[PDB]
Amino acid sequence: GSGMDEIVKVLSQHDRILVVGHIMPDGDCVSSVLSLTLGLEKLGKEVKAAVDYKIPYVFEKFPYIDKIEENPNFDPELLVVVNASSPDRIGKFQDLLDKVPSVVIDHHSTNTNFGNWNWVDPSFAATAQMIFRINKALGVEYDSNLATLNYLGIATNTGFFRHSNADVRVFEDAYKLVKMGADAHFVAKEILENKRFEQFKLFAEVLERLQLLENGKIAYSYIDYDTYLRHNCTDEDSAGFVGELRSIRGVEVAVLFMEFPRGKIHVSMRSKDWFNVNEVAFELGGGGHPRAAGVTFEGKKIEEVIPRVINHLLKKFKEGVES
Amino acid sequence: GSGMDEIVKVLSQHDRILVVGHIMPDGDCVSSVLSLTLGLEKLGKEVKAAVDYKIPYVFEKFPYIDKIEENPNFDPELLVVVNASSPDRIGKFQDLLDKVPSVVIDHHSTNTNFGNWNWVDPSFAATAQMIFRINKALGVEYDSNLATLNYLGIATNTGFFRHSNADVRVFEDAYKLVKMGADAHFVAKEILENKRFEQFKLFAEVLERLQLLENGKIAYSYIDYDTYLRHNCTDEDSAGFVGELRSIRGVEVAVLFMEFPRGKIHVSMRSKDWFNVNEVAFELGGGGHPRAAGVTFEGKKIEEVIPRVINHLLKKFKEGVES
Numbered sequence: 001g002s003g004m005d006e007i008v009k010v011l012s013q014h015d016r017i018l019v020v021g022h023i024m025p026d027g028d029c030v031s032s033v034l035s036l037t038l039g040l041e042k043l044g045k046e047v048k049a050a051v052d053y054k055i056p057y058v059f060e061k062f063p064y065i066d067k068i069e070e071n072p073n074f075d076p077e078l079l080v081v082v083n084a085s086s087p088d089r090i091g092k093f094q095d096l097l098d099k100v101p102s103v104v105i106d107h108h109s110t111n112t113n114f115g116n117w118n119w120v121d122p123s124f125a126a127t128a129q130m131i132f133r134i135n136k137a138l139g140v141e142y143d144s145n146l147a148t149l150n151y152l153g154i155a156t157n158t159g160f161f162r163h164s165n166a167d168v169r170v171f172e173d174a175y176k177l178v179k180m181g182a183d184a185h186f187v188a189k190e191i192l193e194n195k196r197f198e199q200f201k202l203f204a205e206v207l208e209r210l211q212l213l214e215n216g217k218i219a220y221s222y223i224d225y226d227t228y229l230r231h232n233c234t235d236e237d238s239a240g241f242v243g244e245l246r247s248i249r250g251v252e253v254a255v256l257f258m259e260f261p262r263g264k265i266h267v268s269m270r271s272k273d274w275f276n277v278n279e280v281a282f283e284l285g286g287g288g289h290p291r292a293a294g295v296t297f298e299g300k301k302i303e304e305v306i307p308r309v310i311n312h313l314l315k316k317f318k319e320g321v322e323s
Numbered sequence: 324g325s326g327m328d329e330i331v332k333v334l335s336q337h338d339r340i341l342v343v344g345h346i347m348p349d350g351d352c353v354s355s356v357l358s359l360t361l362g363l364e365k366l367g368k369e370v371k372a373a374v375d376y377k378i379p380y381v382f383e384k385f386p387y388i389d390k391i392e393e394n395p396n397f398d399p400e401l402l403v404v405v406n407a408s409s410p411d412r413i414g415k416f417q418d419l420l421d422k423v424p425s426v427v428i429d430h431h432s433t434n435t436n437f438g439n440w441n442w443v444d445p446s447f448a449a450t451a452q453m454i455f456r457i458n459k460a461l462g463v464e465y466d467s468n469l470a471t472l473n474y475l476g477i478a479t480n481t482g483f484f485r486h487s488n489a490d491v492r493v494f495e496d497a498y499k500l501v502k503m504g505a506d507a508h509f510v511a512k513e514i515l516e517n518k519r520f521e522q523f524k525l526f527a528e529v530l531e532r533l534q535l536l537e538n539g540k541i542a543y544s545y546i547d548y549d550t551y552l553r554h555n556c557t558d559e560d561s562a563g564f565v566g567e568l569r570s571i572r573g574v575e576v577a578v579l580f581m582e583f584p585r586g587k588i589h590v591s592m593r594s595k596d597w598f599n600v601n602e603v604a605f606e607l608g609g610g611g612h613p614r615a616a617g618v619t620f621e622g623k624k625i626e627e628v629i630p631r632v633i634n635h636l637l638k639k640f641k642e643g644v645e646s
């Protein structure tokens with residue numbers, strides 16, 4: 001694939017750019033979209049940012065969040081798709097892939113290389129780290145707001161420096177961004193301290209349905225669509241729940257089945273010390289990382305998905321213990 | 324007070340040292356005690372580490388944790404007390420303050436300067452940052468285990484880089500320690516992903532008793548001693564609960580009243596954006612930081628402590644809104 005140098009040249013050559021992130025945006029999406037958009041604007045370019053999805057509440061106080069548009073009305077000369085592993089993930093903007101030359105910048109090993117130019121590097125924990133390097137290579141000077149926005153995705157994708165992907169390069173980037181004015185406490189407060197009361201009630205439903213297997217080493221639970229409705233919640237509200245199940249003493253693998261909307265079952269998997277959940281996800285048609293991976297089924301009963309996923313998980317887990 | 328330079332000289336002059344931390348040890352205690360003990364040992368000194376308390380379960384897999392003794396049986400020429408703000412906090416080792424010259428190293432502004440030499444610097448988020456600087460000044464070379472142990476206290480005292488005390492110096496220290504081999508994911512896994520099932524049941528009791536005041540800006544709850552007993556828990560198990568209450572959308576001040584043992588009521592206070600909980604704590608006879616502070620009552624009914632604390636909190640909160 002192309003490297004950073006080729007993507008920097010392409011970005012330099014084009015002056016009307018649409019930067020696009022993926023649906024159901026998370027911290028790395030907002031971070032990467034806004035950090036690249038602002039970097040390119042500082043070079044004088046005419047740039048718009050777009051996500052075909054409602055921006056979640058926790059991002060509403062971030063600087064420049066209103067630059068992300070659902071309906072940009074912009075005819076770009078270049079499409080730049082960040083942190084999105086496949087064209088279906090960018091919603092209605094995938095139609096532009098047929099009309100406009102495109103750049104892909106992504107850390108997901110699952111990326112389908114759907115751009116005319118692709119820089120995909122899974123050694124990074126966050127696409128925001130790739131945007132940081134692109135901006136510095138282009139000559140962008142950071143201010144505090146841009147540093148805060150670029151810090152955001154590095155923090156969220158590492159669980160705020162807790163996960164296995166928080167390596168030396170993550171800590172060096174975070175130090176450089178805080179030195180340049182990133183407001184680390186602002187980011188933690190807005191992302192992690194805006195919990196709805198209903199999210200506590202929703203998690204109580206998860207605890208009620210929690211089941212342990214394999215001498216307590218596997219824990220799984222589920223939320224069906226009627227339960228989301230009962231609590232005025234969506235799958236936005238159950239973010240972080242599967243990590244709470246991983247946090248139980250003695251659990252090595254945590255799995256959460258989430259039905260939202262009706263008939264769409266998302267499977268979120270996390271592992272603690274050694275089990276490669278990405279191998280299970282891939283074999284079920286999904287994908288991810290060794291310690292965090294997922295699968296999405298459409299048109300299924302939760303009663304069919306759960307036993308299939310658990311069966312495959314148990315088979316591979318029992319292999320790993322003997323090895 | 325004395326600075327770092329004076330304490331480094333004193334540590335250099337003495338070769339039989341007892342390093343002591345405080346009762347109910349947390350991450351910064353274990354981090355500071357072991358990081359200084361190992362640093363001094365690398366200089367060839369005869370050093371023992373002691374805490375007059377059972378070491379919590381989450382520290383049991385850390386390297387060298389068995390170096391912390393409850394019963395050291397050691398006649399030191401120098402006592403070094405780390406991260407303990409007052410002599411009552413070190414249990415039975417306070418008797419040595421009358422017999423042995425003592426050094427105090429602490430970041431708590433509440434420190435009573437009870438050593439013969441005192442280095443107290445509240446600009447640090449963690450005493451572990453002060454130990455890092457002492458060790459480097461003495462000439463200690465870090466290995467991976469020592470870097471992990473020194474990283475521990477910086478992580479735990481900042482809530483793993485979430486709290487208002489996570490400034491540039493915290494991120495630079497963390498980067499330096501990870502560059503020198505600190506296993507950041509190991510630390511997060513052992514400290515944060517060893518939750519007992521009973522802790523979830525205990526927090527459900529907290530949610531049951533949760534009360535909001537002042538248009539949702541104040542949230543408080545309590546755990547009485549019978550409830551700890553009911554769930555086979557101690558105050559070790561409710562660590563982090565008050566931060567969960569602060570995480571509720573719209574809450575500015577969270578307060579958790581904890582009765583453990585019987586008749587001993589600890590009040591934990593956290594604030595989000597602007598309210599100075601340390602001023603309330605101090606006026607009630609406790610102390611702490613602007614965003615995290617506490618008070619401890621002995622010999623009271625929970626029914627007397629709660630309304631007094633809430634009354635004082637409301638009085639000052641209502642002052643801050645007008646200002």
Ligand SMILES: Nc1ncnc2c1ncn2[C@@H]1O[C@H](COP(=O)(O)O)[C@@H](O)[C@H]1O
Nearest residue numbers: 028156157158159163164165289291292
């Ligand atoms: N070891 C890990 N590597 C990557 N992501 C993880 C890990 N553990 C938990 N996660 C979470 O899984 C999600 C994966 O993000 P991404 O790599 O952008 O798909 C993020 O929300 C992470 O916080």
Ligand SMILES: Nc1ncnc2c1ncn2[C@@H]1O[C@H](COP(=O)(O)O)[C@@H](O)[C@H]1O
Nearest residue numbers: 268269286287288289292293294295296
């Ligand atoms: N259906 C899927 N196909 C490919 N990758 C996925 C899928 N679901 C989740 N992932 C990835 O797996 C990790 C964990 O996802 P989640 O459990 O949804 O937070 C993230 O890096 C996701 O991008």
Ligand SMILES: Nc1ncnc2c1ncn2[C@@H]1O[C@H](COP(=O)(O)O)[C@@H](O)[C@H]1O
Nearest residue numbers: 351479480481482486487488612614615
């Ligand atoms: N702004 C803050 N400053 C210091 N400690 C905080 C803050 N917010 C929460 N805390 C917690 O309060 C405790 C205070 O630690 P210490 O400063 O060693 O007494 C630690 O457990 C911190 O994680």
Ligand SMILES: Nc1ncnc2c1ncn2[C@@H]1O[C@H](COP(=O)(O)O)[C@@H](O)[C@H]1O
Nearest residue numbers: 591592609610611612615616617618619
């Ligand atoms: N009774 C007290 N007197 C002085 N400082 C305290 C007291 N209780 C708690 N603190 C400090 O206030 C902060 C929050 O304490 P806690 O809420 O117990 O985690 C920490 O820095 C404690 O060391």
